Design an enzyme around this catalytic site. Structure first.
Site, PDB file in Angstrom:
ATOM      1  N   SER A   1       0.788  -1.227   0.000  1.00 51.15           N
ATOM      2  CA  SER A   1       0.000   0.000   0.000  1.00 51.15           C
ATOM      3  C   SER A   1       0.823   1.282   0.000  1.00 51.15           C
ATOM      4  CB  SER A   1      -0.958   0.021   1.192  1.00 51.15           C
ATOM      5  OG  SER A   1      -2.093  -0.777   0.917  1.00 51.15           O
TER       6      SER A   1
ATOM      7  N   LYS B   1       3.102   6.831   5.424  1.00 49.76           N
ATOM      8  CA  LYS B   1       2.232   5.906   4.703  1.00 49.76           C
ATOM      9  C   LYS B   1       2.750   4.503   4.947  1.00 49.76           C
ATOM     10  CE  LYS B   1      -1.019   4.307   2.173  1.00 49.76           C
ATOM     11  NZ  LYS B   1      -1.091   3.257   3.271  1.00 49.76           N
ATOM     12  N   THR B   2       1.864   3.618   5.387  1.00 47.11           N
ATOM     13  CA  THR B   2       2.236   2.237   5.659  1.00 47.11           C
ATOM     14  C   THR B   2       1.962   1.329   4.465  1.00 47.11           C
ATOM     15  OG1 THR B   2       0.065   1.804   6.649  1.00 47.11           O
ATOM     16  CG2 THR B   2       1.836   2.492   8.120  1.00 47.11           C
ATOM     17  N   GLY B   3       2.427   0.090   4.570  1.00 45.76           N
ATOM     18  CA  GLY B   3       2.109  -0.910   3.573  1.00 45.76           C
ATOM     19  C   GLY B   3       2.167  -2.265   4.239  1.00 45.76           C
TER      20      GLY B   3
END
Length: 264
Positions: A38, A203-205
């Site tokens: 993501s 922002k994570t993923g």
């Protein structure tokens, strides 16, 4: 010795950790390729903001949210509350940065598709990041293929360039920064280990395979200029291994300690 400490994390948890920081230089496996998951959503939002610069009024453009936009995507915190209504492009950006999957797919479409996104990524100077799908297919990788992967160096230079560089103008940088700061999904990743008076946006993923767990952040240390920090983690030897936030926490703490030592 930072190197030794990152290696200890790998020994402890298996797999590979990738680290890059960017000042206005701590790095480890910075050219290794990791599932982007993501995290691609901040590149997409960057692309949308660039689009708005070239297409005045685009951020205010009203987009219908349809049931088929949601589809079988399970994580839709904003879009799922707006089926049969409309959301502005800017509202969809906010949703995407909060990792809303339908929001992301809508933005890719409204941008003109994946080819346009990859063109924008190249404009950023990023020749390492390879995106070939949207959600959820973006999450699926193979150990020896760089498809749908990025490097700590590339992705960290990207977030820094978008927030502080010369592609977006002042108004659009500020908007980008605010989206990242509004994000709530990384509370247990980099943010977990930052001193509490340091400001962060991120922002994570999380792929849901190969233990792929990412966090890419901009950080404003107290009384210092902002920095960017990317931490990517994957276990290419175990497709079914679950995400691991603790390793991100520990890596981030090592980094916070080193930065604090630096600024001291």
């Amino acid at each position: 010795q930072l190197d030794d400490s990152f290696k200890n994390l790998e020994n402890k948890y298996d797999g590979k950790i990738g680290i890059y920081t960017l000042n206005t230089n701590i790095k480890y496996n910075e050219s290794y390729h990791f599932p982007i998951c993501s995290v691609f959503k901040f590149l997409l939002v960057g692309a949308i903001l660039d689009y708005d610069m070239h297409n005045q009024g685009f951020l205010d453009k009203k987009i219908p949210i349809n049931q088929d936009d949601i589809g079988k995507l399970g994580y839709a915190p904003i879009t799922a509350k707006n089926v049969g209504k409309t959301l502005t492009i800017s509202q969809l950006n906010y949703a995407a940065i909060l990792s809303d999957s339908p929001a992301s797919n809508i933005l890719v479409r409204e941008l003109g598709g994946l080819q346009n996104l990859n063109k924008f990524i190249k404009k950023l100077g990023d020749n390492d990041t390879i995106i070939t799908a949207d959600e959820p297919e973006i999450n699926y990788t193979q150990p020896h293929s760089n498809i749908n992967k990025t490097t700590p160096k590339a992705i960290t230079k990207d977030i820094y360039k978008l927030a502080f560089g010369n592609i977006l103008d002042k108004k659009h940088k500020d908007i980008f920064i605010k989206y990242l700061q509004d994000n709530n999904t990384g509370a247990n990743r980099i943010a977990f280990s930052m001193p509490k008076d340091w400001i962060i946006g991120d922002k994570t993923g999380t792929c849901g395979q190969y233990a792929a767990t990412n966090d890419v952040a901009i950080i404003w240390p107290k009384n210092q200029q902002p920095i960017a920090l990317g931490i990517l983690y994957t276990n290419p030897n175990d497709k079914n291994a679950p995400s691991n936030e603790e390793i991100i926490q520990q890596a981030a703490k090592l980094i916070a300690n080193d930065l604090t030592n630096t600024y001291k």
